[PDB]
Paper text:
Here we report on the combined use of MAS NMR, XRD and microsecond-long molecular dynamics (MD) simulations of explicit crystal lattices to characterize the overall rocking motion and the local internal dynamics of the protein ubiquitin in three different crystal forms. We prepared three different crystal forms of the 8-kDa globular protein ubiquitin. These crystals are henceforth referred to as MPD-ub, cubic-PEG-ub and rod-PEG-ub, reflecting the different precipitation agents (methyl-pentanediol (MPD) and polyethylene glycol (PEG), respectively) and the morphology of the crystals. We have shown here that three independent and complementary techniques, NMR, MD and XRD, all provide evidence for an overall rocking motion in protein crystals.
Author numbering: 1 to 74
The structure:
C-alpha cells in the first residue's frame, strides 16, 4: 500500500509501506529518502503523534492516508 508524508515545508513525500510496518520502519523509510535521521523525526496522524513501537494498523492508517512529519532538533 501507499501513504503520504506531508512536510511543514509543503512538499509531499510518498512511501510504499505495509499495514504492519512499525512507525520506526516509517522513520527508516524517510531517512532512506530524505536523509533525516529517525530520532529527529516526529510523526503525526489525525492530530496524534505516533510511537516508534506500534504499527500503522494499530493507528488504523490505511492506504493514501496522510502523515505529518515534524522535526525535533534538540
Ligand atoms: Zn515494511
Ligand atoms: Zn534502507
Ligand atoms: Zn493532515
Amino acid at each position: 500500500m501507499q501513504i503520504f508524508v506531508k512536510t511543514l515545508t509543503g512538499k509531499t513525500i510518498t512511501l510504499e509501506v505495509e499495514p504492519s510496518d512499525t512507525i520506526e520502519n516509517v522513520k527508516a523509510k524517510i531517512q532512506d529518502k530524505e536523509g533525516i535521521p529517525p530520532d529527529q523525526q516526529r510523526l503525526i496522524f489525525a492530530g496524534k503523534q505516533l510511537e516508534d513501537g506500534r504499527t500503522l494498523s494499530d493507528y488504523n492508517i490505511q492506504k493514501e492516508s496522510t502523515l505529518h512529519l515534524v522535526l525535533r532538533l534538540r
